[model samples]
Target chain A: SHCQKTSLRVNFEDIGWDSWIIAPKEYEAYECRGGCFFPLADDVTPTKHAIVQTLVHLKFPTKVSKACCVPTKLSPISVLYKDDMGVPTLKYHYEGMSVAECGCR
Target chain B: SHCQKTSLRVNFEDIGWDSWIIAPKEYEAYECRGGCFFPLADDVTPTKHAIVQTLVHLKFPTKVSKACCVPTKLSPISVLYKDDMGVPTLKYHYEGMSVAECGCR
Candidate 1:
């Protein structure tokens, strides 16, 4: 399977983070999943490191790890929550909270 | 030169983001700097990708890109700021704002 984006809906309540995260009860936090092949393709957004890693894995299957499907580009999300002092707060730019693009690395 | 953590103090006001981030005027946001050597070491936290990339770089210096020193582990920082509506806000966990560890990759 070629590297690609996969669906993942994260419910704050499910992980016991609902009390701190007031708004956006559910978030579509996508993930990356799949395999890497030799002769890396540009569409996979293969880094030079990934390409070489793929080569090593192909040459010595049991020696090293293969390139992994991971989030290459991420986007931030804002959240409205209650602070320690019981103040309603709006926090902007929760960095890298959502995956924007996936790649083999 | 080997992979290492370098000093980098970031003054929010200098970057023109002070108006939004107002708790600590300056932050010790360290960075990664240095060169990746052949036969990677454990201290650098060299990934399999980095090791293979380093090999390729050594074999074909002009053809492939070399491994780079980058932050492998990052820590979060909190900031007290003002919202668009002029309300005081506390944003905990500004993710990946500080480099906690360095690695070659």
Candidate 2:
């Protein structure tokens, strides 16, 4: 409630509809809600399957021939908040705009 | 790059700096670059291992008790691009703000 008033502005464009942001151990559950977007910031790369999986849910046209999703025009959105050590929380509203379901098998 | 000129403005605040944006297969290379934040937007949730693994990279306070990375205040950056069916590409510039490497096993 204290942090809810302050908002972080992000777009579906940059991170897509319901991007899977990274979280510290405590914030793991937030990922389930589809709200965080922390980066690995390492040589360890996010898999193409992971990326395309998210793409399948977007309204954007995409494919999953085994690798990553095709790139698309990004949409923008206002973030709900990012506190507790840089962890991020998105507005539940994003769900309304977020594409649902990964198209990959 | 023709696409580089235009940018997508996502905040590490919303998605975390250098957050792992999802990409279509063609965009797989981009995810390796560490500049996308595509969301699955599906019932399918990203694993805590993956999210926390990414958290290990950010310059925020975190831990790895075998669960998830904690949440924290996020930095923000402009995405380089997303195209070719909603796949995303990131600006090479994000590294300056992004945390590098995962702190977990």
Off by over 4 Å in 1: A1-105
DockQ of each: 0.02, 0.03
For candidate 2, write residues A1-105 as lDDT tens digits: 010111122222232223344322122111111211123223213333233323332322242112221111112223455555766776443222221221111
* Tens digits of per-residue lDDT for model 1, B1-105: 788877766666654567887788888776566778955566996654345445545655674445567566767888898899999798897665776787765
Look at candidate 1 and tell me the lDDT of residue A85. 96
Worst 10 residues of 2 chain B by lDDT: B1-10
Best by TM-score: 1
Please report, in order, the local distance difference test score of every candidate based on alpha carbons.
0.67, 0.26
- lDDT per residue, candidate 2, B1-105, as tens digits? 101111122222232223354421122112111221223223213343233323332323252112122111112334455555666776554322222221111
Error of 2 at A6 (Å): 32
Candidate 2 interface RMSD, angstroms, 1 decimal:
16.5
Interface RMSD of each: 16.1, 16.5
Per-residue lDDT, model 2, residue A18, is: 30
